[PDB]
């Protein structure tokens, strides 16, 4: 009953409609249901699927989907955004990050293959033998394949005379290119910068926050050496000089929010869980944790945003 109604509300509303779902399963379900009932854009902001302060980093395919949504959100004048309540409570990278750290590659651009590799490494992409998943790139001869975050398919670039001669969508299974494109937009491989300037910032803010140990297993030591610990996402705030804003900061004018379910209890349950985890595991020699408010809106703050 939620689906058709949200489609109708969105159809007559001079702005995006944000459907706050009770959980991820419902959210995911509501995507195709609402999509089939409208000609307007329908997106989901996918949950990381990790537990708060998890010892796992979310799958790159989930990150690709989130980056695509966050990138499109500010200019989504019409349509629907579906977001689980616990996900909506999570703070995000500021939108200045995406439009500021995105790189554009165009046909005819003077740039060597190795120079592009350098940019890709600093943007968080992984060098592999064969591209197959979001966030990977492979190089061989004059060719460089990459799977841009937010893209449905990877691309194959041909460098001739140290110039990008062509950029072509490419089908992994058949190892063949499809259409040629004039340019591609390269977003970062994470919702946080990981270049050397970002690592220096991370180190500096970490020192102002936590103790440092030299054990190679310590988070600070791992990031300083250019690696990204499993679950590093829960220290996302340290990669930015300003606090992480609410997702609400990405909503365009006239955004209407619709609630489906018992958001209060769900919201309080999640807050209680993140708080228990922080209290029980926050003081740790190798992975000390940031307080919940560095990463999540408080339940009272959520409802305030819902009434503003
Ligand atoms: Na319709």
From Swiss-Prot:
Subcellular location: Cytoplasm
Cleaved signal peptide residues: none
Oligomeric and partner information: Monomer. Interacts with UvrA and RNAP.
UniProt free text on domains: Consists of a compact arrangement of structured domains linked by long, flexible linkers. The N-terminal region interacts with UvrA, the central region interacts with RNAP, and the C-terminal DNA translocase region possesses ATPase activity. Activity is regulated by a conformational switch from a dormant closed state to an active open state upon substrate binding.
Stated family: In the N-terminal section; belongs to the UvrB family. In the C-terminal section; belongs to the helicase family. RecG subfamily.
Function: Couples transcription and DNA repair by recognizing RNA polymerase (RNAP) stalled at DNA lesions. Mediates ATP-dependent release of RNAP and its truncated transcript from the DNA, and recruitment of nucleotide excision repair machinery to the damaged site. Can also dissociate RNAP that is blocked by low concentration of nucleoside triphosphates or by physical obstruction, such as bound proteins. In addition, can rescue arrested complexes by promoting forward translocation. Has ATPase activity, which is required for removal of stalled RNAP, but seems to lack helicase activity.
Listed name of the protein: Transcription-repair-coupling factor
Gene: mfd
Shown segment, full-protein numbering: 26 to 333 of 1148
